[PDB]
UniProtKB/Swiss-Prot annotation:
One of its GO terms (biological process) is translation. Belongs to the universal ribosomal protein uL30 family. This is Large ribosomal subunit protein uL30. Pfam families: Ribosomal_L30 (PF00327). GO terms for molecular function: structural constituent of ribosome. The lineage of its organism: Bacteria, Bacillati, Bacillota, Bacilli, Lactobacillales. Part of the 50S ribosomal subunit. It comes from Lactococcus lactis subsp. cremoris (strain MG1363). Keywords: Ribonucleoprotein, Ribosomal protein. CDD domains: Ribosomal_L30. One of its GO terms (cellular component) is cytosolic large ribosomal subunit. PANTHER family: LARGE RIBOSOMAL SUBUNIT PROTEIN UL30M, MITOCHONDRIAL RIBOSOMAL PROTEIN L30.
RNA sequence: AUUGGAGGUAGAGCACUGUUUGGGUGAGGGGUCCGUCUAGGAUUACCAAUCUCAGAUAAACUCCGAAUGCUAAUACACAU
């Protein structure tokens, strides 16, 4: 499963344990779809951070 | 993200320290009279000496015991 990564919310107004995670995925402005790394357990990014990104199978 | 530990916090029940509701349990301590060789046997009365059974009760209760988080290694992702 190879998944690209989207956005639904600005990072303003959340935990820095969300800020640095979005930073770790490295998107910058919104919905710059980082077409990368659908390997699991950094699916913990897409699932711990699941309030934020549509799972888009790249 | 997984594994590894650690912490007793919240919660709870009471396992101890505290407080406490009943019910049972009882010397005794104050009410007949026999009665001050003579003490008493007493009547019931408040607690009934504990303990027993349910009922709780808490920051300085904890036989327990989280979820969270913190840390170690590993994994993957990055760039510090």
């Amino acid at each position: 499963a190879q998944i690209k990564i989207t956005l639904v919310n600005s990072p303003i107004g959340r935990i820095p344990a969300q800020r640095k995670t979005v930073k770790a995925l490295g998107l910058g402005k919104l919905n710059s779809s980082v077409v990368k790394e659908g390997s699991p357990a950094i699916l913990g990014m897409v699932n711990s951070i699941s309030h934020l990104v549509k799972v888009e199978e790249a």
